[PDB]
Amino acid sequence: PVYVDFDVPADLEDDALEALEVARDTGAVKKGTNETTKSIERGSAELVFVAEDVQPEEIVMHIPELADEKGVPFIFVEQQDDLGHAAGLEVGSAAAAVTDAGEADADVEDIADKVEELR
Amino acid sequence: TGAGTPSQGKKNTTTHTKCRRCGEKSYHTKKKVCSSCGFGKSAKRRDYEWQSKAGE
């Protein structure tokens, strides 16, 4: 809400979550804001996910700007338990990151690209 | 009318009665509060430090 400056069209979000599920079973992913944050910092981040239904918003506010000053692409998700389930957790996740996808590099790429265009 | 003896005659009202909690005849049946143990006003028992000399 305060850290969201663009609305990710349902479909786009569905695609993204899809890529995440394969990213976990093909390559590597980081689940949890702290871990996500350290990816963007260490550069080892390709595509990061952030939930919109986070409260306190503090927990995620920094992702957007941080990712920008690191060229790391990021996308929003509506539900919190969806991003969590996608990452492969039975719990929810405020934010996850795709550390080197896998058989999704193509998709993730376009997603990153589709978002850019979504300005 | 004298405030003395003549005003004593109308005193046939009941106020303080045996208290269900402390047994003292201090339960004001109109106030439903015991002037002795505080029953009806306080869960804690009525007690003040001035009931004895400061150093005792």
């Binding site: - | 009941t14 009665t17 045996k18 005849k25």
Partner: protein, 46 residues
């Protein structure tokens, strides 16, 4: 006045406590009820 069942039990006990010290207790102790109350002269609680 209208007495309740509880008030009545108390008045009852008071009447009983208002009895003499049995004759034998005198003998049994080689030899006074300090709680002898009168309906007129004295005044029960409540």
């Amino acid at each position: 006045g209208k007495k309740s069942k509880a008030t009545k039990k108390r008045l009852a006990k008071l009447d009983n406590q208002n009895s003499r010290v049995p004759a034998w207790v005198m003998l049994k102790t080689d030899r006074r009820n300090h709680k002898r109350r009168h309906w007129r002269r004295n005044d029960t609680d409540e």
